Structures are given as structure tokens and as C-alpha cells.
Amino acid sequence: KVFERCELARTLKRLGMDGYRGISLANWMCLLKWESGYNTRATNYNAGDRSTDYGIFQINSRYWCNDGKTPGAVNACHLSCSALLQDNIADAVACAKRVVRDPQGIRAWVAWRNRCQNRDVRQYVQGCGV
């Protein structure tokens, strides 16, 4: 599923993402926009280390989910990576909350640092009723 902007903003709000661990909705929206263009079946293979990024958050298989084909990987969200390819984003959201419970927080995603950090991200939630 490819979410429309405001539809996604309210979906995240309903799932408890607004201000989760100090992360605003606008930050999450900017992350998802740049990570997958709000696409839940987006997937990316990393040939350098044999890992794969899954779904709307582009969560990596080396540490967060199990796909059975990433060498020496772990599964911190205790989910099959297939769970991160569903149209329903509840499981991916639970995993993204798990990711930010770590020290780095939202900084876990390099893309967020590149195009969200220290930027005006207000535009991502404007007019969405959140």
C-alpha cells in the first residue's frame, strides 16, 4: 500500500506515534516520506552486507526482523520481516517504537539525519487534522 500523506499522519497518530519518545508526528512523516515514499511493500537489498530493508520504515534485517537469509543477524522486534510488508502498519509501528527505544532514537535512520534533522518538517502534517 502507498499511503496518502494525511491518511498516514492520522494512522500514525492512532497507533500512538505522536510524540513517542519525544518524536513528533512531523518527524516520523518526514522519515517515512524519504525512506519509502509512504510505501509498505518497499524493499531494498544491500549487497555489501547481505541485509534487506523492509516496508514503509525500511527496517533492516540484520538486527530488527528475521528473514532467515541475513548472516549473523538478530531479530530485536521478534517479527518475520514479512510482517513489515503488510498494508496494515501496526507491526511495523511496534518495531519502529522498539528501534527508537535504543540510544540513538530517531537518529537510527541515516535518511532522517540527511533530510529531516534540523529542518522545517511542519509541512508534512499541515492540514491533516493531527
Domains of the chain: 1-130 (1.10.530.10)
Which grid cell is 96? 519502529
Residue 35 annotated to the active site: yes
DSSP 11-36: HHHHTT-TTBTTB-HHHHHHHHHHHH
Which grid cell is 83? 510482517
Question: In Å, what resolution does this model reach?
Answer: 1.8
Which grid cell is 97? 517504537
Q: Are 66 and 80 in contact (CB under 8 A)?
A: yes
Query: 4, 7, 49, 53: which is the annotated catalytic residue?
Result: 53
Q: 3-state class of 42 per DSSP? A: coil
User: What phi-psi label fits residue 3: left (phi over 0), alpha (psi between -120 and 50 degrees) or beta?
Assistant: beta
Query: 4, 35, 67, 91: which is the annotated catalytic residue?
Result: 35
Instruction: Judge residue 1's burial from the number of C-beta atoms within 10 Å of its C-beta, 0-12 exposed, 13-18 middle, 19 or more buried.
Output: middle
* Amino acid found at 33: K
- DSSP code of residue 43: E
Half-sphere exposure of 83 (CA within 13 A, CB side): 18
Q: Do the strands 59-60 and 51-54 form a parallel or antiparallel pair, or are they unpaired?
A: antiparallel
Cα dihedral value 120, 11, 77, 68, nearest 10: -100
Residue 53 annotated to the active site: yes
Give the Cβ contact number of residue 41 at 10 Å.
14
Which grid cell is 53? 530493508
Buried/exposed code over 84-110 (b: 16+ C-beta within 10 A; e: otherwise):
bbeeebebbbebbbebbeeeeebebbe
d(CA 42, CA 125): 22
CA dist 30 → 35, 45, 67 (Å): 8, 22, 27
Which residue spans within 4-129 are E strands per DSSP?
A: 43-46, 51-54, 59-60
